[PDB]
Structure formats: structure tokens, C-alpha cells
Amino acid sequence: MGPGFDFAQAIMKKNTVIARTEKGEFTMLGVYDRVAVIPTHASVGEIIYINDVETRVLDACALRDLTDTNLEITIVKLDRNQKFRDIRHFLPRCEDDYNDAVLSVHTSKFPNMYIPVGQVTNYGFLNLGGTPTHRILMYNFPTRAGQCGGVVTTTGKVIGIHVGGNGAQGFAAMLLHSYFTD
Ligand SMILES: Cn1ccnc1-c1noc(C2CCC2)n1
Numbered sequence: 001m002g003p004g005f006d007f008a009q010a011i012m013k014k015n016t017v018i019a020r021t022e023k024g025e026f027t028m029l030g031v032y033d034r035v036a037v038i039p040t041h042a043s044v045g046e047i048i049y050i051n052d053v054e055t056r057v058l059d060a061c062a063l064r065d066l067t068d069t070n071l072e073i074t075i076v077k078l079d080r081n082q083k084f085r086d087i088r089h090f091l092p093r094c095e096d097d098y099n100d101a102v103l104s105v106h107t108s109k110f111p112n113m114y115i116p117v118g119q120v121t122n123y124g125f126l127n128l129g130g131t132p133t134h135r136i137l138m139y140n141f142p143t144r145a146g147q148c149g150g151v152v153t154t155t156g157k158v159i160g161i162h163v164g165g166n167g168a169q170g171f172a173a174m175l176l177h178s179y180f181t182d
Pocket of ligand 1: 105110113115141142143144145146147
């Protein structure tokens with residue numbers, strides 16, 4: 001409808017795949033080469049399904065901060081025959097608050113879905129499904145599930161992936177440039 005949805009659409013069309021683990025379906029954001037992110041609660045194993053194709057996982061790392069606290073981001077390298085468009089220059093360098101954000105979700109149940117969630121707070125600490133978690137972004141999200149792995153963008157920045165909600169708010173794990181320096 002506007003430049004928010006325009007940026008979101010451009011990220012969803014080129015940089016998302018459908019990931020399926022034993023824990024269900026996830027929006028998965030490709031960042032560069034064969035490297036993607038998914039919420040840690042997806043429990044990635046040795047094999048994952050990518051757009052319904054059996055794919056060997058070459059490496060998978062559940063990120064934690066330097067206090068050894070969960071960040072809820074798993075970085076996955078996929079044994080895929082094709083690279084993602086490099087979107088590392090759209091990642092923020094520092095923890096921040098944001099205006100006018102959009103959550104975008106791509107699944108086999110919820111095709112091409114874009115939610116204007118609006119103002120995003122640097123919330124920080126959250127007890128997420130019983131797990132102490134840091135670098136949480138918080139927004140208004142009065143709904144249900146199937147969003148997990150959904151990508152949170154502003155105009156010009158990819159700022160997080162959706163990891164949960166309490167029926168009134170939604171929560172995203174920050175994406176930072178320094179996670180994907182190589
Ligand atoms: C139905 N569904 C499936 C995935 N996401 C949603 C959804 N519904 O409403 C919303 C928010 C509440 C205001 C817009 N998200």
C-alpha cells in the first residue's frame with residue numbers, strides 16, 4: 001500500500017523460504033550465500049525441509065549474548081544449490097527503538113501476509129516460554145501463532161524475526177550486522 005509494505009515485499013519475495021522442522025513450519029530469512037536465520041525453538045537438526053525439499057544442514061548455531069543468555073536466533077547454513085541476495089547492508093548495527101514497522105509472514109497456511117505493527121520498543125529482557133531472553137523487540141500484536149520466523153522491517157532496515165507473543169503484544173529477536181560478519 002505504501003513504502004513500508006514495498007520494502008517488506010522486496011525482502012519477502014527474494015530473501016524468505018518456508019522451513020519445516022519436527023517443531024512445525026517457520027518463515028526463514030536468508031541473509032547472504034547459503035546462510036539463514038530461524039527461531040531457536042524450531043530445534044534445527046541435521047536435515048531440514050526448505051520449500052518441501054529435503055536439505056542437509058551444514059552448520060547451525062544457537063546465538064547467546066556474552067552473559068550466556070539466549071538470544072532466540074539460530075544461524076543455519078543450508079546445503080542448497082543457490083545463494084540468497086546479500087541483505088547484510090539492511091541490518092542495524094546497534095540495539096534501537098523503531099517507528100512504523102511491518103511483520104511479514106510466508107507459510108503454506110498464511111501465504112504473503114503483511115501486518116503493520118507500528119511502534120517497536122527495545123524491550124530487552126523477556127522470560128520467553130520460561131527461557132530468560134535478551135535483545136527483545138516488543139510491538140502491538142493482538143492475535144495467535146504461525147508467525148514465528150516472520151520478518152520485522154522498517155523502510156530500509158531488516159530489524160528482527162518474530163519469536164512469540166502474549167495475545168496482546170508480539171516479540172522479535174534483534175538482528176544485528178555483527179551476527180553475520182565473515
Ligand atoms: C490471522 N492471522 C494469521 C497470522 N497472523 C494473523 C493475524 N491476524 O490479525 C493479526 C494482527 C492483529 C491485528 C492484525 N495477525
